[PDB]
């Protein structure tokens, strides 16, 4: 059955926003985008839908929200409840791949899983074939901070290799290359990837004081030791991240 590896199900089981930015951060991100009363936003890669349910509450934003996994799609879905917010965001439980909106977008995002177009470039012309005219692409990317010196360093911050990721003037540079204005921008800062990460190990500590018979209970045990220590030394220092709004020129 389609869904993320369990790893991430059981370290993000209690995260509204699967990513390093804060939920004043997302809320700046909302009102910068200056979106009208009904604008349809489509969200690939929408996690437990933090995105679309907040900005359906505060702009009256319509739209959808596609997600691998089944507990986040869940999860989007009693949030949109809870916030009176169900008749105006939908969450599709799918492999967001290839997914083209024929109903098209006025804010067509991918925020924080780029993979699923294979890349920057190509997220961002997947993204653009469900963009309405005049609308707004939404992209969450890594970015080096500061540029890592070996690759030790890269693979410490869970990148493959030192070329993953680009420097910030660097990304924008690129968007300009493939086409695109940059329209606005939201990042992060250290205080929101410890709020992304740091949140992970008490789910963590929970979750094996629950579970402490479990195949997984080993593996976490061990990334709970190490995680705290990893992610201060790399993370924290070396890799930025941020949203960027984009317009075709
Ligand atoms: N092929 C795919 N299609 C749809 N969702 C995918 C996917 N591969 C990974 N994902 C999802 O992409 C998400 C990455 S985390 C970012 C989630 C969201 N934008 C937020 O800010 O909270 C995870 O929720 C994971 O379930
Ligand atoms: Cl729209």
Same mark, same amino acid.
């Given at each position: ?28 991100? @909302? ?6 009363? =009904? ?9 437990? =839908? ?9 702009? @009256?934003?319509?739209?959808? &929200? ?27 439980? =799918?492999?967001?791949?290839? $997914? ?5 977008? @006025? ?9 699923? &177009? =294979? ?45 993953? !990721? ?8 690129? !968007?300009?290359?493939?086409? $695109? ?11 929101? #990837?410890?709020? $992304? ?9 929970? #979750? ?20 705290? @220590?990893?992610?201060?030394? $790399? ?15």
């Amino acid at each position: 059955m389609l869904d993320i590896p369990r790893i991430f199900t059981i370290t993000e089981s209690a995260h509204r926003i699967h990513n390093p930015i804060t939920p004043e951060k997302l809320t700046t991100l @909302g009102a910068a985008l200056r979106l009208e009363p =009904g604008t349809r936003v489509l969200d690939l890669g929408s996690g437990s =839908g933090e995105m679309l349910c907040t900005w359906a509450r505060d702009h @009256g934003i319509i739209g959808t &929200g596609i997600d691998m996994s089944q507990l986040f799609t869940a999860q989007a879905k009693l949030r949109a409840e809870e916030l009176g917010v169900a008749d105006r965001v939908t969450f599709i439980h =799918g492999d967001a791949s290839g $997914y083209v909106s024929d109903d098209k977008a @006025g804010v067509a995002a991918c925020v924080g899983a780029t993979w699923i &177009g =294979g890349g920057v470039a190509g997220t961002i012309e997947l993204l653009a074939r469900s963009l309405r005219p005049g609308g707004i692409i939404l992209i969450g990317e890594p970015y080096w901070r500061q540029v890592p010196p070996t690759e030790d360093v890269a693979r410490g911050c869970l990148a493959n290799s030192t070329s993953d !990721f680009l420097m910030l003037p660097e990304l924008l540079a690129s !968007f300009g290359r493939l086409g $695109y204005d940059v329209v606005e921008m939201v990042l992060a800062d250290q205080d929101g #990837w410890d709020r $992304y990460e740091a949140a992970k190990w008490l789910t963590m500590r929970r #979750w094996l004081e629950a579970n402490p018979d479990d195949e997984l209970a080993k593996e976490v045990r061990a990334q709970l030791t190490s995680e705290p @220590g990893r992610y201060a030394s $790399y993370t924290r220092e070396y890799l930025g991240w941020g949203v960027f709004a984009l317009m075709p020129r």
